[PDB]
Structures are given as C-alpha cells and as structure tokens.
C-alpha cells in the first residue's frame, strides 16, 4: 500500500515504542525514590488515541489506595 491505512499501522507502532521508552524512563525514576509514594512493582504502558480504535467507553471506576499512589506518581511524573 501507499499513504493509506498502513499509516494507521504506523501510529500503532509508535505507541509501542513510546510505551517501552517510558517503561525504562519510569524505571530510572522509581530507582531515584526519595518522594515515591506508591513505590511498588509497576509496568505502565503509554499509547496514543489517534490510531488505537475505540476499545470501550473507558470507564472511571475507583482504584485501590496503593495503586492510586502508584498512578499518582506516574501522572505527576
């Protein structure tokens, strides 16, 4: 193909690249510690909405407190 849905597949691949780069980058920052609230085992992935289709309604349910601190670190970081 040319400049078509293969481009949609291009963005799909970029997200995997960003997920692992942020994975090791977050590994370095959880190594620094000092102000880490939820300092437990995390493997967080980063994707983009431009190429992944609608998975679901993306609900907004609650999160357990220990994961909440873990999620708060990454979102702040």
């Amino acid at each position: 193909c040319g400049c078509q849905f293969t481009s949609k597949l291009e963005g799909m691949f970029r997200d995997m690249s960003i997920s692992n780069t942020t994975m090791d980058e977050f590994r370095q920052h959880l190594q620094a510690t000092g102000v880490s609230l939820g300092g437990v085992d995390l493997t967080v992935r980063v994707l983009t909405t431009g190429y992944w289709p609608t998975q679901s309604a993306t609900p907004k349910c609650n999160i357990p407190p220990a994961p909440r601190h873990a999620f708060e670190i990454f979102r702040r970081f």
Binding site: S56, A57, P59, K60, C61, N62
Partner: peptide
C-alpha cells in the same frame, strides 16, 4: 460505594 459502570460490571 464504588461508582461502578453499567452491565459490564
């Protein structure tokens, strides 16, 4: 006490 979504629960 959860603010849970619809039937998908």
């Amino acid at each position: 006490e959860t603010d849970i979504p619809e039937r998908e629960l």
